[PDB]
Design a protein around this ligand. Structure first.
Ligand SMILES: C[C@H](N)C(=O)NS(=O)(=O)OC[C@H]1O[C@@H](n2cnc3c(N)ncnc32)[C@H](O)[C@@H]1O
Length: 441
């Protein structure tokens, strides 16, 4: 089968042959978008093009964009290790139309690449599509132009409990370009639990969302109002790891060539032997987000972007502790990561030494309190009455041991214990009041 690198290149070659300008991945950190924590989509760097504020010499483009979804509008951190399809760091294979082609040709391009004998040649019968309920045009295209049997065309409304809150209406964030979308799903088979989109078991890993095609129509405002974009446009993204799983005839993203090699490296540095352990997958994912974030300029801190990075690093180190790592290990994964990322890791390779030192320093710093904090958490859980850890304890782990509350919740989750978030926040607010009282005016 094709490697992840070959699949990335094949996608770009396809759209290039269809007249799309190949544009390099942007950084994970925007310089000119205050509404954006980390790059969470291929379209981010073209946001102003969609808004009609920026013009390019090309009207159609294709990228393989590195994305991190660990905060803001799109945050999958808590899904990592619990599904076979969610990462913090991942690549979007995208094509874009800036007032060029629209609905029909976007769908045809995607179907052709996916199903043509000349290209990816996926079995058509295992492909399902969803459309926004009101998008009669998209429904007709799949049914009559493409020829998907009606039983595999699913209409999805505002299933998230609010106007425009839908799996088939994509939004960059609370503000920004948005519009109705159509998604392509692949059925991995009855050996995997799950039902098709729209069904009660849709959240299973059986029917995987591979490719989302957005018909950009509006610019959302802070108040929630939709203002029409100057030109209806197209924003698409196929998950590289997810299509790689399909093409390499495996079911989990973590079973693709990239992750198989990376997980082996994690086992090597932690001393783990059970290659099926959940923590190995978590660490493999976390090194990708952490290493690339540092390469793109993020430094660990206790505020904003730096704190999200610190939280992910420390959670990764914690998982290494559960696997029984005897020494500093996380920074040792930068090399192996560069080795599996191909051309998509060039920015990381350029700064390998710097990234390694940052991760080494951060792990050593956290090691000063990690085992001691875990010992306290064990002590408190052993005598805990009920299914919820008190907020005072979560706060003490935060204040004394530097345990972010989500790191503490992560450990407790593994033992079917919840954390009193309201209690933690109350404790944090009490401390802020003490600081204000002591500092004065
Ligand atoms: C196209 C639109 N701008 C967009 O971002 N759509 S999307 O949110 O659905 O993401 C595009 C694709 O990336 C993949 N993807 C999204 N989140 C992911 C995650 N947390 N981990 C791995 N892949 C993800 C899925 O294949 C998804 O269809």
């Amino acid at each position: 089968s094709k490697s992840t690198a070959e699949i990335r290149q094949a996608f770009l070659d396809f759209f290039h042959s269809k007249g799309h300008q190949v544009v390099a991945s942007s950084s994970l950190v925007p310089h000119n978008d205050p509404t954006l924590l980390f790059t969470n989509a291929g379209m981010n760097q073209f946001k102003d093009v969609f808004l009609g504020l920026d013009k390019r010499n090309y009207s159609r483009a294709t990228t393989s964009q590195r994305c991190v979804r660990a905060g803001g509008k799109h945050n999958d951190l808590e899904n990592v290790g619990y599904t076979a399809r969610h990462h913090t760091f991942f690549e979007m294979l995208g094509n874009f139309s800036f007032g060029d082609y629209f609905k029909l040709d976007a769908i045809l391009f995607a179907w052709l690449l996916l199903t043509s004998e000349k290209w990816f040649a996926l079995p058509k019968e295992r492909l399902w599509v969803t459309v926004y309920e009101s998008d009669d045009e998209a429904y007709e295209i799949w049914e009559k132009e493409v020829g998907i049997p009606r039983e595999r065309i699913i209409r999805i409304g505002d299933n998230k409990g609010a106007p425009y809150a839908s799996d088939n209406f994509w939004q960059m964030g609370d503000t920004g370009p948005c519009g109705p979308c159509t998604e392509i799903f692949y059925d991995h088979g009855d050996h995997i639990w799950g039902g098709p989109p729209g069904s009660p078991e849709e959240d299973g890993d059986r029917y995987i969302e591979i490719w989302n095609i957005v018909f950009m129509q509006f610019n959302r405002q802070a108040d929630g109002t939709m203002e029409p974009l100057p030109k209806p446009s197209v924003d698409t993204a196929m998950g590289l790891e997810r299509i790689a799983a399909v093409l390499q005839h495996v079911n989990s993203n973590y079973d693709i060539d990239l992750f198989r090699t990376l997980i082996q490296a994690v086992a090597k540095v932690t001393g783990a032997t059970d290659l099926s352990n959940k923590s190995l997958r978590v660490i493999a994912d976390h090194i990708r987000s952490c290493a690339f974030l540092i390469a793109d300029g993020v430094m660990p801190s206790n505020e904003n972007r730096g704190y999200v990075l610190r939280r992910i690093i420390r959670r990764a180190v914690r998982h290494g502790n559960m696997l029984g790592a005897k020494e500093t290990f996380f920074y040792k994964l930068v090399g192996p990561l560069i080795d599996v990322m191909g051309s998509a890791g060039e920015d990381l390779k350029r700064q390998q030494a710097q990234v390694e030192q940052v991760l080494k320093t951060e792990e050593e710093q956290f090691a000063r309190t990690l085992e001691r904090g875990l010992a306290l958490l064990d002590e408190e859980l052993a005598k805990l009455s009920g299914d919820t850890l008190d907020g005072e304890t979560a706060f003490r782990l935060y204040d004394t041991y530097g345990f972010p509350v989500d790191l503490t919740a992560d450990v407790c989750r593994e033992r079917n214990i919840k954390v009193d978030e309201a209690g933690f926040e109350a404790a944090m607010e009490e401390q802020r009041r003490r600081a204000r009282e002591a500092s004065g005016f």
